[PDB]
Amino acid sequence: DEDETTALVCDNGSGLVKAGFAGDDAPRAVFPSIVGRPRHQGVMVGMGQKDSYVGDEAQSKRGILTLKYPIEHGIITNWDDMEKIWHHTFYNELRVAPEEHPTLLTEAPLNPKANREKMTQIMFETFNVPAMYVAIQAVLSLYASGRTTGIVLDSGDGVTHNVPIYEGYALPHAIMRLDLAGRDLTDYLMKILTERGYSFVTTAEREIVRDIKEKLCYVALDFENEMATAASSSSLEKSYELPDGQVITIGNERFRCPETLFQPSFIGMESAGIHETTYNSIMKCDIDIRKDLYANNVMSGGTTMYPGIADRMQKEITALAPSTMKIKIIAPPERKYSVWIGGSILASLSTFQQMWITKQEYDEAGPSIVHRKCF
Amino acid sequence: DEDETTALVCDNGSGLVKAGFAGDDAPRAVFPSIVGRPRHQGVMVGMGQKDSYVGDEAQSKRGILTLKYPIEHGIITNWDDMEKIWHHTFYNELRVAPEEHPTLLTEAPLNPKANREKMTQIMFETFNVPAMYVAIQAVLSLYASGRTTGIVLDSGDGVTHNVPIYEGYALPHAIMRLDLAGRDLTDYLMKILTERGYSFVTTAEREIVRDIKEKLCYVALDFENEMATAASSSSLEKSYELPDGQVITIGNERFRCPETLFQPSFIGMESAGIHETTYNSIMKCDIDIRKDLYANNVMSGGTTMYPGIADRMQKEITALAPSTMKIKIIAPPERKYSVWIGGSILASLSTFQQMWITKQEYDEAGPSIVHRKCF
């Protein structure tokens, strides 16, 4: 803010990319993370007002774009289209030069070592940004929620991580990476459909599977109790019309898919569901740490959107843990965008200075600097 | 035969249609799959001893036939001419009534739902065939080979499939379709030729492009290594004169087209060439299958017809995959007809009892019978 280190905020999420100024309630420019290259070349018949297709203009008219995804799962296949993406982001809708103001970015949990310096290198050395920082996705949520201690589960849509939080910042040991997330459930559902006879192999119908799950699917109170229920037909089979060709009936699979977070055995993971993994991180921390960790439990992300994810967690948690303190699960009305919300709040507040990384700080210790200050 | 279920084998594919009886090791009748109706027409002036033009007599004449192609990419646009095609197939060269003997047919991979029942309807209802079955094209090839292990890459000519095989039938989950195939190369060569200065837009010269490619074209050991070699004009440019009235000099382009099978970037595909696609299919189908798959990889169809196809695969495969097992490429002397050869053996053998569909099984499970029995 006016030759101040503050930080303009860009969230690099799987669905859309949100960017804007520090100290502002909502993002300015929003577009899909895709960059166009030719798909059926033939040669250039003519070019539609630009060399490469990037952002909102590209998605609306589709076609030429190969639907190349620079960012997914937190990992980037090709850096070259990225330079164009930030160009569209700052110059076209923000209407401000990146050189003039500070930049804040969101850090996907357990991201590769190469990416932090590479992302930073483009903005400082290439475009001369006065300062910039990449924020920890899990840490931001805790301050936004208004709690100073606990355990936070936070997934943007790409990956899911369990990060315990203490008065001091958490370090690698306790934190674990989980492969179960909301996008995963959409992919998982197609796999189960195979036994009756329904298949959606191509990306054209990929969107449809996602649509089916959020409007009609729900989370079973207990999978073991309701399995017996599936023999009869009433609640499990519901008539639904898909606009394109045929009727689809889904019963047991509607709840079988959501059941994945609590029952990983069907999908194929060694680790137990989300409630079991929560116990592991809390247990190995320092002994005075535990009493206020249990009081605050935070559930967030796309996979917690279902009709009652929060209710299941309380029964199970109290059985294998100490009974000397309150157990409560906190789930905000809009936990899915809790990731984005924390980042905007950080920009607004000046408490954020201890947390961030300076350009000079990167070469004092080298490429290992991101690990040194954050997880 | 006479009443035993056995089989009559008729193969509908991208080149020619082969028909015969089970227990027989060679085809009885072969003709191109084309049916003719008037072209310029002018109403009618008489009949050329054939109401509709079908089979071997038709192709030699050319001229009158519309060159209507009943089968494209595994999909048939018009079924009315189909009835005539089988009429020529069984009644003339075979000299046996379809009504009298059971029929075995070949299934084009990832074929549309409408076609299985439609094909079945023509035989059992219209012509009263005692029994029939449709067999999956990738599965048949492995038995002719005699191998009980190995991966089969097979293309009729129209399409390319990377279906996994383990002495059984594989589900839709592990099978991929590729838009890159042997007929494709013939079409591709005209497309690339446009930058150089040659055009073959009309259908009259469509046949000619194929002829150029098979006799003189070859597959470069490494495209990256020989690009430099292009400047020297000795091996690359050969003087060939086309029978009609033009001279065509082809150099870099002769191997540039073959190069397409291993380097899709010039054509315009997001996926990597056939060797990479093989890795994609191998990772997903089953890990334990891999040790025996690399040793026994099989290349078949029009695509692998060009000399030197087997050697390139050996160098490329070891770079992105495990190095704990033997690497060899197996291409039989007549891999182009490998699809048909395997099918005859299944008809001949009594093992196929578990694997086939009877005349009233279709009625018992309804239109959904094909899906119930096979993927």
Added chain:
Amino acid sequence: DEDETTALVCDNGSGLVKAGFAGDDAPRAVFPSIVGRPRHQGVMVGMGQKDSYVGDEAQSKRGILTLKYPIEHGIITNWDDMEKIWHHTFYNELRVAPEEHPTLLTEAPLNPKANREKMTQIMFETFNVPAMYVAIQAVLSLYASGRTTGIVLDSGDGVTHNVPIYEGYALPHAIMRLDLAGRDLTDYLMKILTERGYSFVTTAEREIVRDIKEKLCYVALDFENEMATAASSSSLEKSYELPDGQVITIGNERFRCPETLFQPSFIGMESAGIHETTYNSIMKCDIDIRKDLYANNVMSGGTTMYPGIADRMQKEITALAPSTMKIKIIAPPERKYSVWIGGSILASLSTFQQMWITKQEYDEAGPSIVHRKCF
């Protein structure tokens, strides 16, 4: 041999399972202790030649298997895969029926009540074995060493125990269990590396850390003196190249990791190291027993494998313990396998018969039989 006992010897160890006949110099059949199920489902394409993957054949494929470990901390998570493991052990390489001959098994110290009987139940009632015994791991090592009294430290890999031994057998009261061991050191090394800038979160690099530690690591003599030495780069930093693409420099950390064995303070636990706990076990024991205990000290297991481990013990032990008697540390040329090289002597020998537990005795006494004959 067939008529009476003699007894087969099977050691259920940390990395390999050894089985064989009595009176034998070495074990007959050895394989890794792992059982596989499908890792990523996608049901089955063909079959990997077995319903379940067990032993040496299973390890070679290593991909499709779930890497489920039947033995951890001397505790078995799932009994069902165990039945298959013994099936491979006796029928495949021994080429003798378990039913025909008696079985001897190694007992992990301070093991759960359920396990002795459960292990016994499978072999007797399920397979009708004539006789089966489980031996005390700490007791066997002492006889192999040829010493009748002393303090024995023995760790296979999973756990570390300090059990003092007198002319008569020891009982729970004067024995201790430690969670710090040789496999722990492999895990421990990753935790320290965080300060320098190296992190290996995944299991793929887990194996690599183990490789680093045994070839170059050593155990520092008096840690407090050596910290000043840390400034000098001649001994602490060595250049070593990792096969997968990274450079690893280990200095202070190479000796600091082994240090944890003697200095628990760095990790954050209030549990004392091996030399302090040695004092604890001896103090508990009767007053006229200590003088012969101090003269002979036995060190064994993975922990004592590193060069220079024996010398440190002499200096440290006398500091907090009495100085009125000779202090000597005895380490055999091979102590890692000392666990296994104990059971063989008291298996081959006829004397061992009085010590063991047999079929009828288990039923006659009941669930209390393990306690009745052993501490």
